[PDB]
Design a protein around this motif. Structure first.
Motif, short mmCIF file in Angstrom:
data_model
loop_
_atom_site.label_atom_id
_atom_site.label_comp_id
_atom_site.label_asym_id
_atom_site.label_seq_id
_atom_site.Cartn_x
_atom_site.Cartn_y
_atom_site.Cartn_z
N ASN A 27 49.54 -41.75 -20.57
CA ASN A 27 49.00 -40.52 -21.42
C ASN A 27 50.31 -39.91 -21.58
OD1 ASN A 27 48.62 -39.20 -18.90
ND2 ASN A 27 46.60 -38.81 -19.44
N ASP A 34 41.34 -36.89 -18.31
CA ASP A 34 41.91 -37.52 -19.87
C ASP A 34 40.24 -37.31 -20.53
OD1 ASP A 34 44.47 -38.55 -21.30
OD2 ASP A 34 42.68 -39.45 -22.21
N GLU A 75 30.13 -44.90 -22.26
CA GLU A 75 31.46 -44.44 -22.79
C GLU A 75 32.07 -45.13 -22.96
OE1 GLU A 75 32.57 -40.68 -21.12
OE2 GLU A 75 32.98 -40.07 -22.82
N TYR A 128 35.08 -42.69 -16.63
CA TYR A 128 33.80 -42.34 -18.36
C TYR A 128 32.75 -43.03 -17.57
CZ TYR A 128 38.47 -42.94 -20.02
OH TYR A 128 40.04 -42.63 -20.41
N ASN A 142 41.53 -42.87 -14.97
CA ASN A 142 40.49 -41.97 -15.33
C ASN A 142 38.50 -42.57 -15.01
OD1 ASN A 142 40.26 -38.73 -16.93
ND2 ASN A 142 39.10 -39.96 -18.53
N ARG A 179 57.73 -41.80 -27.03
CA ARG A 179 57.62 -40.47 -26.51
C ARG A 179 58.55 -39.59 -27.97
NH1 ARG A 179 52.70 -42.45 -25.16
NH2 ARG A 179 52.21 -41.66 -23.04
N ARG A 192 35.35 -42.97 -25.72
CA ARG A 192 35.49 -41.31 -26.24
C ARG A 192 36.70 -40.54 -27.13
NH1 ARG A 192 36.41 -38.37 -20.28
NH2 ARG A 192 34.30 -38.41 -20.56
N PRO A 193 36.03 -39.89 -28.01
CA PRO A 193 36.95 -40.23 -29.28
C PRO A 193 38.11 -39.45 -27.98
CG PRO A 193 34.49 -39.67 -29.75
CD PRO A 193 34.43 -39.74 -28.11
N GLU A 194 38.11 -38.14 -27.61
CA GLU A 194 38.33 -37.55 -27.34
C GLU A 194 39.63 -37.77 -26.46
OE1 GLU A 194 35.72 -36.50 -26.15
OE2 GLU A 194 35.39 -35.72 -24.38
N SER A 195 39.99 -38.70 -25.80
CA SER A 195 39.97 -39.84 -24.58
C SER A 195 41.68 -40.26 -25.74
CB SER A 195 39.67 -40.93 -24.20
OG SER A 195 40.73 -41.59 -22.90
N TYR A 196 42.66 -40.42 -24.53
CA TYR A 196 43.23 -41.01 -25.38
C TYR A 196 43.93 -42.30 -24.70
CZ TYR A 196 48.67 -42.69 -24.81
OH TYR A 196 50.18 -42.62 -25.19
N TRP A 197 42.68 -42.90 -24.33
CA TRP A 197 42.92 -44.50 -25.12
C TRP A 197 41.98 -44.70 -25.70
CZ3 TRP A 197 43.77 -42.20 -19.65
CH2 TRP A 197 44.88 -42.56 -19.27
N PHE A 198 41.70 -44.03 -26.20
CA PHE A 198 40.22 -44.10 -27.64
C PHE A 198 40.63 -45.83 -28.10
CE2 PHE A 198 38.46 -43.88 -31.31
CZ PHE A 198 37.19 -44.01 -31.37
N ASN A 199 39.20 -46.34 -27.93
CA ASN A 199 40.15 -47.94 -28.87
C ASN A 199 40.48 -48.77 -28.27
OD1 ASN A 199 38.14 -47.75 -30.59
ND2 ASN A 199 38.96 -48.27 -32.28
N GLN A 200 41.27 -48.54 -26.61
CA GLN A 200 41.91 -49.30 -25.95
C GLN A 200 41.32 -49.94 -24.80
OE1 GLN A 200 45.66 -47.53 -24.72
NE2 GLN A 200 45.59 -46.26 -26.86
#
Ligand code: CLA
Ligand code: CLA
Ligand code: CLA
Ligand code: CLA
Ligand code: CLA
Ligand code: CLA
Ligand code: CLA
Ligand code: CLA
Ligand code: CLA
Ligand code: LHG
Lengths: 165, 73, 63, 144, 741, 80, 39, 73
Positions: free
Chosen positions: C46, F60, C59, C55, C53, E706, C14-22
Motif C-alpha cells: 500500500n 489498512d 469481508e 479482515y 492486513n 507512485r 472492504r471498500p476503504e481498504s487499499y486492496w479492494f477488489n484485489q
C-alpha cells in the motif's frame, strides 16, 4: 481553390520567398572562395533549398497569402482534391506505429505478469522475449481486433480496484 | 491569458491595417513574444524615464506594481 | 476450521481498504471471536509500505 | 503506587545557559518541569540546544512546552536507560503530574486504565456529513 | 604517531556480479523494486556513502575512488576541448588575426537545416562562436599549431585512463586504511609544497621558456610559422639570449644572489600590454615564481615524522580566550572524522575563491586579446560567479548534514560550536533584522525613485542630479590604488589594474580596459547585492544552526537531515528540515547572482566596453547606467527590453539557436512552477485514475506508479527553476554580446 | 483541541503510542485482538496534530485518526 | 558475461541503445530524404 | 455633454484626479480630454452605452444617479 488558397506552383509569394532564401544564401556565399569547404557547404544548402521548393510545388500543396504551404485536414477535401498525403496517410501511419508500440508493450507486460518476479522483468528488460514480441507485433491490428471480438481485451469490473465512493 | 492574448493581437493587427502580420507571426511562439509582447510594450515602459513623463506613466507604474505583487505571491 | 483455507486466494470486499477488489493469499485465520480473524498477505504494498492486513469473515470472498 | 511530589530544591544539570530557554509564558501561562535519577555524571544533549552534564542522582530541568520534556524523556530512556517523569507548573504554584500518568509507561498495557475516544466500528462505517449537518457547531462525522 | 602508507590488499573483487543487482549499496534498496519511488531512491542514495555503511574506512575509500573517477571525467572534457581546437577549430587562422576573426571550435552536421548555425566566424571557417576563451589561453601558453593541441588531447585521454585505473586500483587492489586518510598534517604539507608550489614552479618554468619568447615574438610581428619551436628555444641559449640578455648568464645569477640580472623577464610592469590588451607574461612568470616559493615555504609547517613542525591540535587548543570558554577543543577530531564538515569548509572557500577569480579576471585580463573579446569576458565572469554561488550553497548544505549526522554533544561541551548553538536565537534574530533593514534601505530607494519619476518629480529621486549617495569609501580606495605606484609601490611601474584610474588601453579599435567610476546607481546596486547575500546567509545559517532542534520541533535531529515535514500539527510544520533551508537558499542564491550578473553586464556595456572613435570613446549603450539604473523601470526598459532585441530577432542567422533556447528556457522555468506550487496528494489521486484506465485494458505495470515524494517535488522544482532562469540569462547574454560585441 | 479517535481495527501493536511525541495515546486492556490491548486517547488536550501516530499505524485502513480542531496554546505547540 | 549482459539489459542501457537506434534511423531517413513534409 | 457632439475625436473622462503627490509635470500630463485639471480617461464604455440608451445631458445622469442611490438605500 479550397478556402481561397492557391496552389504553391502558381503563387507569387512562394516564388518571392524562394528568391529571398536563395538571395541571402548567395549573398553569404559571395564572401568565400570557390574551392573551399564553406563554399561547397553553401552550394549544397542552396541545392537542398531548390530541391525542397521544387518538391513542395510538385506535390500540389496549397499555399496561402504568405507564400507558405497549408495542410488539408478534412478527409473529404483531402480525398477529393488530391491532398490525402498531407493529413490522412500520415495519420494512418502514426496509428499503425502507435498501436504497434502499444501492443508490443502490452504483450510484454502480460507475458512477464505471470512470472515469479515481474518487477525484475520490468527494471531489467528480457531482451529475447522483447525482441520476439517486437518482431511479432506486425500483426497488431488483426490481433487487437481478434482480442476485442473474443472479449479478452478488457478486464471485468469486479477485478479492478476503485475508490470507496 | 491565452484567449485574451489572441483577441488583443488579432484586433491590434486588424486596427493597424496589417492582418498579415498576425497571420504570419501567430504560428510560432517567437512571433507572439517579439511581435506582440515586445513590440506593443515600447510605449508602456516609456511612461516615465529620465527625460520626463507623460499620461502613460500610471500604466507603467501599474505594470511594475502587478509584477511585484505576482513575485510576492 | 472456520473461514478460508490457509494458503488460498481471496478477494477483498472492504471498500476503504487499499486492496479492494484485489486478490490476496490467506496466511492465518484466528480461532477466537475476534472481529477480523482472517490474515491476508498481498504481493503489492500500500502507500504505507504494508503487505499484510486483517479482515473479517464476510469481508473476504473466495476468488 | 503513589503520585510523586515535586522537590524544588533538586539539583539541576550543569548547563551554561542558552537563548532557547523559558519565555514570558513560563511566568504568565504555564511551564513544565522534568525530573529524573541518573546513576552517574554524563554529558547529554539539551532539547533547546547545547550540551549539558547530568549529575549523579536527582536532576531537575525547566522547559516551555510538554514536547520538550517528552523529547528529553525519550532521549534519556533510549540512550542511557533511565526513568524520567515530568509535571506542569502554573504561576500560582500548582504542580500537576503528567507522564507517566499511572506510573507505568503507556507503551505497555496496565490494569486500571479505561479506553477513551474509541469508536467501536471502522472508518468505512462512519456516517455521511449530511447527517451531522446543522449541528451546534462544525462537527465531523467521526466525532459521534 | 607514525606517518606511513597503510593499505589493504584486494578488499573488493573486480566483477560484474553487482552490476546486474541495482540498489545493492543500501539495505533498503537491495530487496528490489515494488513501486516507482524505489527507482528515484536508487538515484538519490547512490553517492550517499555514509548511509550505505557506518564504517568510516569504507566511506573514505569510496570517496578516494570517486575523486579519481571525477578527475578522469575532467580529463576527458579537457582532451575533448583540445581535440576540438585541433580538428574542428580555426585557431591557426585566429592566431594570424586575433582582432577580426571570431573564435570557433564547433561544427554541426548538415542535417534538418541546422547548417545555418555554422556562421561565418572568419578566417575561411564556418562554425559556432565559442566564449570559453580557450583560444586566448592557448595563445598565452605559446601554442601555434593544431599538432600541439592534438598531442595535448591524446595526453589528456591517456591521463583520463590513468585516473580511472588509479580509482579501480585504489578500490579493488590497494585500498588505504583509515589512518592513512587521517594524516591531515602530512596531507596539508604535501598539498602546500608539492601540489601548489611545484605546480606554480613548473608553470613558471614553462612560461619563462615557452610562453615568454613565443608570445614576445608574436607581439613583435613575427608570423606564427616563422617562430621557433618551443624545444628550439629550450635547446640553445643563443635565441633566448637574443630575446633576453639575462639568459646569456645561465643560472649563475640565481645562485649568486644576483637576481637583479633577471630584470628583463621578471618585472613589475603592471597595467596591460598595449598590443594584446592582456597582462604582461613577464609579470605572470615572476608572479608564479614568487607564488611557488611562498607555497614551498608554507609546505614545511606541520610535523609529519620528525620533531620539527606543528601539530594542528596543539595550535587549536592553544587558542582560547575569556569570551569563548574552552575554545577550539575538539575541532581537530571533528574535521579528522567527518567528511561533510571538511566538504562544507572546502566548498565555502572554493566558491568564494571562484567569485574572486571572476572579479580578478574581468578587472586584470591575463590572456592576450582577452579583454577585446567582450563575449568571453562576460561569459567567463558569469560562469565563474554561478559556480561560486552553487558551491557556497552546497557548503551550507554539508554544514547542516554534519550538524545532523556527525555531530556528537559528548565532545562539544563548552567549545565555540556549543556556544553558537546556545545563542543561535540571538544570531538568527539579529541577522533577520539586518536583512529587513538592508531590504528596506535597498529596495525602498528604487521604489521611491520609480514613484518620484512617475509622479513627475525627478528632483526628489536618489540620483547624481538629485539627492546623491556617492560611495566615498570605494572612490577613495580607487584613488589610493591609482596613486600606489608612486609612494607605496616605488618598484612598480603601473597600477595593478586600469579600473582604478588613469589612461585607458584599447586594442583594435575596441576598449580593452578603462577606469570605472562609481556613482549613486553603483551605490544602490551594491547595497542590493549586500542585502541579497545577507538573506541567503540567513536562510543557510538558520538551516545549519536549527538543524538538530528548534523551538517548534525539539527532536528534529531524530527526523534526519532530509525529511518533508513533521505533519500539519502545531499550525503546520512544512519545510522544517535543513534540506528545505538549502532548497530556499538555492532560490535566493539564484536571485542574488542574477542581479550581480545583470549589474556586471550593464556596467561593462555602458561605461567600459565600446568602440574607439576619433577624439572620443563611444560605449555600447551610451553610458546610460549613471542615469537609468536607479529605477526598476530603467532596468526593465533599457537593460531588459532594449538589450533583448538581439536574442528575439536572432532567427534566420547563426544565433537563432540562442533564440530557441531563450524560448526553451522560459518553458523549463515555468515548468518548475508545476512542482513548486502543488502537492503530491493530487498527483497520487490522478495517478490512481490513470492506473484504473490501465487496469481496464490490462496494461497496468507490476511496479506500482507512485507520485514523486514531497522532497523530490521540491528538488525537481528548484532544479527546473534554476535551469530555466540560468539558461534564459545565458541565451540573452550570449546572443547580445555576440551580436554587438 | 484536535479530535483523536481509535477504531475497532486496532491490533494493539503499540506502535502509535511510541510514535506519539506529546504523550496523548496509551494502551488499555481489550478483548478484540490477539494482543488483548487497544490504543486510547485520554489526553487529547495536549495533541498538536503531527499525525505521527497515523504514520506509525500499520492497519489498512488506519485505526487511529486525527481531525484538526480548535487551535490553542498546547495544540499549536507554542513555547511563548 | 551473463552478469554483463544482465547489466546491458537494464532499463537505462536498453533505453540508451533503443533511443540511439531510433534517433539514428530518423536522422539517416531525413539525410537521404531531405525535407519531407508530405507523402 | 461634449463627447456626444463629437464621439469620434473626443476621449471620455472617468473622473478627476486630486493627488497631492503629483508635481507640475504630472498635472499637465494628466490634463487631457478638454478638462481643466488632471482627469482619468475612462475605458469602461459607459459613455457609448448611456448615449445609445438616451442620455444626452448631464442632468439625465444626475437624475439617474440620484434615483439609483435612493433605490440602493
Ligand atoms: C472529425 C470531424 C469532421 C468534421 C468537423 C467534418 C466536416 C466536414 N466534412 Mg467530413 N468526414 C469525417 C469527419 C469530419 N468531417 C470523417 C471521419 C470522414 C470519414 C468517413 C469524413 C468524410 C467526409 C466526406 C466524404 C466528405 C466530408 C465533407 C465535409 C464537409 C461538409 C459536410 C459535412 O459537414 O457533413 C459531415 C460529413 C459527413 C457526415 C461525411 C459524409 C459526407 C456528407 C454526406 C456530405 C456530402 C454531401 C456533399 C458532397 C456536400 C458538398 C456540398 C457542396 C460543397 C458541393 C465539412 C467541412 C464533404 C466535403 O466537403 O467534400 C469535400 C464530403 O463529401 N467528410
Ligand atoms: C506498455 C506501455 C503503455 C501502454 C500500452 C499505455 C496505454 C495507455 N496509456 Mg500510458 N503510460 C505509459 C505506458 C503505456 N501506456 C508509461 C511508461 C507512462 C509514464 C510516462 C504512461 C503514462 C500515461 C498517462 C499520464 C496517461 C496514460 C494514458 C494511457 C491510455 C491512453 C492512450 C495514450 O497513448 O496515452 C499516452 C501514453 C503515454 C503518455 C506514455 C507512452 C509511453 C510509451 C510510448 C509506451 C511504451 C514505453 C515502454 C518503455 C515500452 C515497453 C518496453 C517493452 C517492450 C520491453 C492508454 C490505454 C492516459 C490515461 O489515463 O488513460 C485514458 C493518461 O493520462 N499513460
Ligand atoms: C571494469 C572495472 C570495474 C568493475 C568490474 C567494477 C565492479 C564493481 N565496483 Mg568499481 N570501480 C572501478 C572499476 C570497476 N568496478 C573504477 C574505474 C573505479 C573508480 C571510479 C571504481 C570505484 C568503485 C567504488 C567506490 C565502488 C565500486 C564498487 C563496485 C561493485 C559494485 C558497483 C557497480 O559496479 O555498479 C555499477 C556502477 C555504475 C555503472 C556507475 C558508473 C559511473 C561511472 C564511474 C562514471 C560515469 C560518468 C558519466 C559518464 C557522467 C554522467 C553524465 C551523464 C549525462 C551520462 C562492483 C563489484 C562499489 C562497491 O564495491 O560496493 C560497495 C563501490 O562503492 N567501484
Ligand atoms: C606532493 C604530493 C601530492 C600531490 C601532488 C597530490 C595531489 C593531489 N591529491 Mg594527494 N595526498 C598526498 C600527496 C599529494 N597529493 C599525501 C601525502 C596524502 C596522504 C596524507 C594525500 C592524500 C590525498 C587524498 C585523500 C586525496 C588527494 C587528492 C589529490 C588530488 C586533488 C585534485 C586536485 O584538485 O588537484 C589537481 C589535479 C591534478 C593536478 C590532476 C593531475 C594529477 C597528477 C598526476 C598529480 C598526481 C600526483 C600524486 C602524488 C600521484 C603521483 C604518485 C604516483 C604513484 C602516481 C591531487 C592530484 C584527492 C584525490 O583523491 O584526487 C583523486 C583526494 O581525495 N590526496
Ligand atoms: C620547474 C621549472 C623549471 C624547469 C623544469 C627548468 C628547466 C630548464 N631550465 Mg630554467 N628557470 C626556471 C625554471 C625551470 N627551468 C625559473 C623559475 C627561472 C627563473 C629564475 C629559470 C631560469 C632559467 C635560465 C636563465 C636558464 C634556464 C635554463 C634551463 C634548462 C637547462 C637547466 C640548466 O641550466 O642546467 C641544469 C641541470 C639540470 C637541470 C640537471 C638535469 C637532470 C637530468 C634530467 C637527469 C637525467 C638523468 C637520467 C638518469 C639519465 C638517464 C637516461 C637514460 C635514457 C640514459 C632546462 C631545460 C637554461 C637554458 O635553457 O638555457 C637557454 C638557462 O640559461 N632556466
Ligand atoms: C564537492 C561537491 C559536492 C559533493 C561531493 C556532494 C556530495 C553529496 N551531496 Mg551535495 N551539494 C553540492 C555539492 C556537493 N555535494 C552543491 C554544490 C549543492 C547545491 C546545489 C548541494 C546540495 C545537496 C543537497 C540538497 C543534498 C546533497 C546531498 C549529497 C550527498 C548524497 C549524494 C547525492 O546528492 O545524491 C545523488 C546525486 C544526484 C541524484 C545528482 C542529481 C542530478 C541533478 C539533479 C542534475 C543537475 C542538472 C544538470 C547540471 C543539467 C542537465 C541538463 C539536463 C537536460 C540533462 C553526498 C554526500 C544529499 C544528502 O545530503 O544526502 C542525504 C542532499 O539532499 N547535496
Ligand atoms: C518580489 C517578491 C518578494 C518580496 C517583496 C519579498 C520580500 C521579503 N522577503 Mg522573500 N521570497 C520571495 C519573494 C519576495 N520576497 C520568493 C519568491 C521566495 C521563494 C524562494 C522568497 C523567500 C524568502 C525567504 C526564505 C525569506 C524571505 C525574506 C523576505 C523579507 C526580507 C526583508 C526585507 O527585504 O526588508 C524589506 C522588505 C521588502 C523589501 C519588501 C517590500 C517592501 C516595500 C518595498 C515597502 C513599501 C511600504 C509601503 C509604504 C507600505 C504602505 C502600504 C499601504 C497600502 C498602506 C522581505 C519582506 C526573508 C525574511 O524573512 O526576512 C528577513 C527570508 O528569510 N523571502
Ligand atoms: C525604505 C527606503 C526609503 C527611504 C530611505 C526613503 C526616504 C525618503 N523619502 Mg520615500 N518612499 C519609499 C521608501 C524610502 N523613502 C517607498 C518604498 C515609497 C513608495 C511607497 C516612498 C514614497 C515616498 C513619497 C511619496 C515621499 C517620499 C519622501 C522621502 C524623503 C522624506 C521622507 C520623510 O521625511 O519622512 C520622515 C522620516 C522619519 C520621521 C524617520 C526617519 C528615520 C530615522 C532617521 C531613523 C532613526 C533610527 C535611529 C538610527 C535609531 C538610533 C537608536 C538609538 C541610539 C537612538 C526621504 C529622503 C518624500 C520626498 O519625496 O521627499 C522629497 C515624499 O514625498 N517617499
Ligand atoms: C507532434 C509535433 C510534431 C509533428 C506532428 C511533426 C512533424 C514533422 N516534422 Mg517536426 N519537430 C517537432 C514536432 C513535430 N514534428 C518538435 C517538437 C521539434 C523540435 C525538436 C521538431 C523539429 C523538426 C525538424 C528539425 C524537422 C522536423 C521535420 C518534420 C516532418 C518530417 C516527416 C518525416 O520525418 O519524414 C517521414 C518519417 C518516416 C518515413 C519514418 C516512418 C517510420 C517507419 C520507418 C515506417 C512506418 C510507417 C508506416 C514532419 C511532417 C523535418 C522537416 O523536414 O519538416 C518538414 C525536419 O527537418 N521537425
Ligand atoms: C566585529 C567584532 C568581532 C567580535 C570579536 O571577535 O571580538 C573578540 C572576542 C574575544 O574572543 P576570545 O578572545 O575569547 O576568542 C579567542 C578564541 O576564540 C580563539 O581566538 O570575541 C567575541 O567577542 C565573540 C563574541 C561575538 C561578539 C559579538 C559582536 C557582534 C558584532 C559583529 C557584527 C559585525 C559587523
Amino acid at each position: 481553390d479550397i478556402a481561397g488558397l492557391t496552389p504553391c506552383s502558381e503563387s507569387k509569394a512562394y516564388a518571392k520567398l524562394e528568391k529571398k532564401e536563395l538571395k541571402t544564401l548567395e549573398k553569404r556565399l559571395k564572401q568565400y572562395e570557390a574551392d573551399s569547404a564553406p563554399a561547397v557547404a553553401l552550394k549544397a544548402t542552396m541545392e537542398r533549398t531548390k530541391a525542397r521548393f521544387a518538391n513542395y510545388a510538385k506535390a500540389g500543396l496549397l499555399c496561402g497569402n504568405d507564400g507558405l504551404p497549408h495542410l488539408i485536414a478534412d478527409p473529404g477535401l483531402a480525398l477529393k482534391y488530391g491532398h490525402a498525403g498531407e493529413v490522412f496517410i500520415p495519420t494512418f501511419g502514426f496509428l499503425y506505429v502507435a498501436g504497434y508500440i502499444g501492443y508490443v508493450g502490452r504483450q510484454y507486460l502480460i507475458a512477464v505478469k505471470g512470472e515469479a518476479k515481474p518487477t525484475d522483468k520490468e527494471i531489467i528488460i528480457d531482451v529475447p522475449l522483447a525482441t520476439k514480441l517486437a518482431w511479432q507485433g506486425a500483426g497488431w491490428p488483426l490481433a487487437a481486433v481478434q482480442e476485442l471480438q473474443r472479449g479478452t481485451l478488457l478486464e471485468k469490473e469486479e477485478n479492478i480496484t476503485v475508490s470507496p465512493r | 491569458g491565452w484567449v485574451t492574448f489572441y483577441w488583443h493581437w488579432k484586433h491590434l493587427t486588424l486596427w493597424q491595417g496589417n492582418v498579415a502580420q498576425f497571420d504570419e507571426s501567430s504560428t510560432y511562439l517567437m512571433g507572439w513574444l517579439r511581435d506582440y509582447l515586445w513590440l506593443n510594450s515600447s510605449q508602456l515602459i516609456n511612461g516615465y524615464n529620465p527625460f520626463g513623463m507623460n499620461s502613460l506613466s500610471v500604466w507603467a507604474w501599474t505594470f511594475l506594481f502587478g509584477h511585484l505583487i505576482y513575485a510576492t505571491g | 476450521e472456520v473461514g478460508p483455507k490457509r494458503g488460498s486466494l481471496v478477494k477483498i470486499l472492504r471498500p476503504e481498504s487499499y486492496w479492494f477488489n484485489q486478490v490476496g493469499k490467506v496466511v492465518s485465520v484466528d480461532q477466537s471471536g475476534v472481529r477480523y480473524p482472517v490474515v491476508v498477505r498481498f504481493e503489492n504494498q500500500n502507500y504505507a509500505g504494508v503487505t499484510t492486513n486483517n479482515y473479517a469473515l464476510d469481508e473476504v470472498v473466495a476468488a | 503506587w503513589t503520585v510523586p511530589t515535586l522537590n524544588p530544591d533538586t539539583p539541576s544539570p550543569i548547563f551554561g545557559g542558552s537563548t532557547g530557554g523559558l519565555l514570558r509564558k513560563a511566568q504568565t501561562e504555564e511551564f513544565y518541569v522534568i525530573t529524573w535519577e541518573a546513576k552517574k555524571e554524563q554529558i547529554f544533549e539539551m532539547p533547546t540546544g547545547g550540551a549539558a552534564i547530568m549529575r549523579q542522582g536527582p536532576n531537575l530541568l525547566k522547559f516551555g512546552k510538554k514536547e520538550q520534556c517528552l523529547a528529553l524523556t525519550t532521549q534519556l530512556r533510549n540512550k542511557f536507560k533511565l526513568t524520567p517523569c515530568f509535571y506542569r507548573v502554573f504561576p500560582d504554584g500548582k504542580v500537576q503530574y503528567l507522564h507517566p500518568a499511572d506510573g507505568v509507561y503507556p507503551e505497555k498495557v496496565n490494569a486500571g486504565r479505561v479506553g477513551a475516544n474509541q469508536n467501536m466500528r471502522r472508518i468505512g462505517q462512519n456516517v455521511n456529513p449530511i447527517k451531522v449537518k446543522f449541528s451546534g457547531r462544525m462537527m465531523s462525522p467521526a466525532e459521534i | 604517531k607514525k606517518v606511513k602508507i597503510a593499505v589493504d590488499r584486494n578488499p573488493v573483487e573486480t566483477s560484474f556480479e553487482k552490476w546486474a543487482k541495482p540498489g545493492h549499496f543500501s539495505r533498503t534498496l537491495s530487496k528490489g523494486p515494488n513501486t516507482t519511488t524505489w527507482i528515484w531512491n536508487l538515484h538519490a542514495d547512490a553517492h550517499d556513502f555514509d548511509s550505505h555503511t557506518s564504517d568510516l574506512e569504507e566511506i573514505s575509500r569510496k570517496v578516494f575512488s570517486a575523486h579519481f573517477g571525477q578527475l578522469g571525467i575532467i580529463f576527458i572534457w579537457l582532451s575533448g576541448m583540445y581535440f576540438h581546437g585541433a580538428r574542428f577549430s580555426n585557431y591557426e587562422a585566429w592566431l594570424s588575426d586575433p582582432t577580426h576573426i571570431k573564435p570557433s571550435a564547433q561544427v554541426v552536421w548538415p542535417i534538418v537545416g541546422q547548417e545555418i548555425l555554422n556562421g561565418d566566424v572568419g578566417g575561411g571557417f564556418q562554425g559556432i562562436q565559442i566564449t570559453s576563451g580557450f583560444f586566448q589561453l592557448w595563445r598565452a601558453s605559446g601554442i601555434t599549431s593544431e599538432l600541439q593541441l592534438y598531442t595535448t588531447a591524446i595526453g589528456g585521454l591517456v591521463m583520463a585512463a590513468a585516473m580511472f585505473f588509479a580509482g579501480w586500483f585504489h578500490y579493488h587492489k590497494a585500498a588505504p586504511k583509515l589512518e592513512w586518510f587521517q594524516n591531515v598534517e602530512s596531507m596539508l604539507n604535501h598539498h602546500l609544497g608539492g601540489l601548489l608550489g611545484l605546480g606554480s614552479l613548473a608553470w613558471a618554468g614553462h612560461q619563462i621558456h615557452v610562453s615568454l619568447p613565443v608570445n614576445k615574438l608574436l607581439d613583435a610581428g613575427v608570423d606564427p610559422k616563422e617562430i621557433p619551436l618551443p624545444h628550439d628555444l629550450l635547446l640553445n641559449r643563443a635565441i633566448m639570449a637574443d630575446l633576453y640578455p639575462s639568459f646569456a648568464k645561465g643560472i649563475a645569477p640565481f645562485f649568486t644572489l644576483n637576481w637583479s640580472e633577471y630584470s628583463d623577464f621578471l618585472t613589475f610592469k603592471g597595467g596591460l600590454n598595449p598590443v594584446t590588451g592582456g597582462l604582461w607574461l613577464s609579470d605572470t612568470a615572476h608572479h608564479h615564481v614568487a607564488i611557488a616559493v611562498l607555497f614551498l615555504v608554507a609546505g614545511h609547517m606541520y610535523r609529519t615524522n620528525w620533531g620539527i613542525g606543528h601539530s594542528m591540535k596543539e595550535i587549536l587548543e592553544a587558542h582560547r580566550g575569556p569570551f569563548t570558554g574552552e575554545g577550539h577543543v575538539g575541532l581537530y577530531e571533528i574535521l579528522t572524522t567527518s567528511w561533510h564538515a571538511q566538504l562544507a569548509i572546502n566548498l565555502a572557500l572554493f566558491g568564494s575563491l571562484s567569485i574572486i577569480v571572476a572579479h580578478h579576471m574581468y578587472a586584470m585580463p591575463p590572456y592576450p586579446y582577452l579583454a577585446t573579446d567582450y563575449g568571453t569576458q562576460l561569459s567567463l565572469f558569469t560562469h565563474h560567479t554561478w559556480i561560486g554561488g552553487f558551491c557556497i550553497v552546497g557548503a551550507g548544505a554539508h554544514a547542516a548534514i554534519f550538524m545532523v549526522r556527525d555531530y556528537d554533544p559528548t565532545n562539544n561541551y563548552n567549545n565555540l560550536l556549543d556556544r553558537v548553538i546556545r545563542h543561535r536565537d540571538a544570531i538568527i534574530s539579529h541577522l533577520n533584522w539586518v536583512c529587513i533593514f538592508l531590504g528596506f534601505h535597498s529596495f525602498g530607494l528604487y521604489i521611491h525613485n520609480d514613484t518620484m519619476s512617475a509622479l513627475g518629480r525627478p528632483q526628489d529621486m536618489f540620483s547624481d542630479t538629485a539627492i546623491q549617495l556617492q560611495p566615498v569609501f570605494a572612490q577613495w580606495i580607487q584613488n589610493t590604488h591609482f596613486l600606489a605606484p608612486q609612494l607605496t609601490a616605488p618598484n612598480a611601474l603601473a597600477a595593478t589594474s586600469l579600473t582604478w584610474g588613469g589612461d585607458l588601453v584599447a586594442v583594435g579599435g575596441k576598449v580593452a580596459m578603462m577606469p570605472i567610476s562609481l556613482g549613486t546607481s553603483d551605490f544602490m546596486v551594491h547595497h542590493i547585492h549586500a542585502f541579497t547575500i545577507h538573506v541567503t546567509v540567513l536562510i543557510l545559517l538558520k538551516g545549519v544552526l536549527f538543524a538538530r532542534s528548534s523551538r517548534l520541533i525539539p527532536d528534529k535531529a531524530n527526523l534526519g537531515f532530509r525529511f518533508p515535514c513533521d505533519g500539519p500539527g502545531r499550525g503546520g510544520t512544512c519545510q522544517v528540515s535543513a534540506w528545505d533551508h538549502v532548497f530556499l537558499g538555492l532560490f535566493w542564491m539564484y536571485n542574488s547572482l542574477s542581479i550581480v550578473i545583470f549589474h556586471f553586464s550593464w556596467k561593462m556595456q555602458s561605461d567600459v566596453w565600446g568602440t574607439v572613435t576619433a577624439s572620443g570613446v563611444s560605449h555600447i549603450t551610451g553610458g546610460n547606467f549613471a542615469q537609468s539604473a536607479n529605477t526598476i523601470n530603467g532596468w526593465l526598459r533599457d537593460f531588459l527590453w532594449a538589450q533583448s532585441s538581439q536574442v528575439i530577432q536572432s532567427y534566420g542567422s547563426a544565433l537563432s539557436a540562442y533564440g530557441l533556447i531563450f524560448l526553451g528556457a522560459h518553458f523549463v522555468w515555468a515548468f518548475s512552477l508545476m512542482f513548486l506550487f502543488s502537492g503530491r496528494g493530487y498527483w497520487q489521486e490522478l495517478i490512481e485514475s490513470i492506473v484504473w484506465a490501465h487496469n481496464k485494458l490490462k496494461v497496468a505495470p507490476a511496479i506500482q506508479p507512485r507520485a514523486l515524494s514531497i522532497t523530490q517535488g521540491r528538488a525537481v522544482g528548484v532544479a527546473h527553476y534554476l535551469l530555466g532562469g540560468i539558461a534564459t540569462t545565458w541565451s540573452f547574454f550570449l546572443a547580445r554580446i555576440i551580436s554587438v560585441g | 483541541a484536535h479530535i483523536v479517535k481509535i477504531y475497532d481495527t486496532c491490533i494493539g501493536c503499540t506502535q502509535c503510542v511510541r510514535a506519539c511525541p506529546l504523550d496523548v495515546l496509551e494502551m488499555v486492556p481489550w478483548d478484540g485482538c490477539k494482543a488483548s490491548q487497544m490504543a486510547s486517547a485520554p489526553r487529547t488536550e495536549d495533541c498538536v496534530g503531527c499525525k505521527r501516530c497515523e504514520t506509525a499505524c500499520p492497519t489498512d485502513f488506519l485505526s487511529v485518526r486525527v481531525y484538526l480542531g480548535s487551535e490553542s496554546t498546547r495544540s499549536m505547540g507554542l513555547s511563548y | 558475461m551473463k552478469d554483463f549482459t544482465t547489466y546491458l539489459s537494464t532499463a537505462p542501457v536498453i533505453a540508451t541503445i533503443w533511443f540511439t537506434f531510433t534517433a539514428g534511423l530518423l536522422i539517416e531517413i531525413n539525410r537521404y530524404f531531405p525535407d519531407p513534409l508530405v507523402f | 455633454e461634449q463627447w456626444v457632439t463629437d464621439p469620434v475625436h473626443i476621449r471620455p473622462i472617468a473622473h478627476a484626479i486630486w493627488d497631492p503627490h503629483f508635481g507640475q509635470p504630472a498635472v499637465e500630463a494628466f490634463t487631457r480630454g478638454g478638462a481643466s485639471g488632471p482627469v482619468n480617461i475612462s475605458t469602461s464604455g459607459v459613455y457609448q452605452w448611456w448615449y445609445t440608451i438616451g442620455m444626452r445631458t448631464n442632468q439625465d445622469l444626475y437624475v439617474g444617479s440620484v434615483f439609483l442611490a435612493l433605490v440602493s438605500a
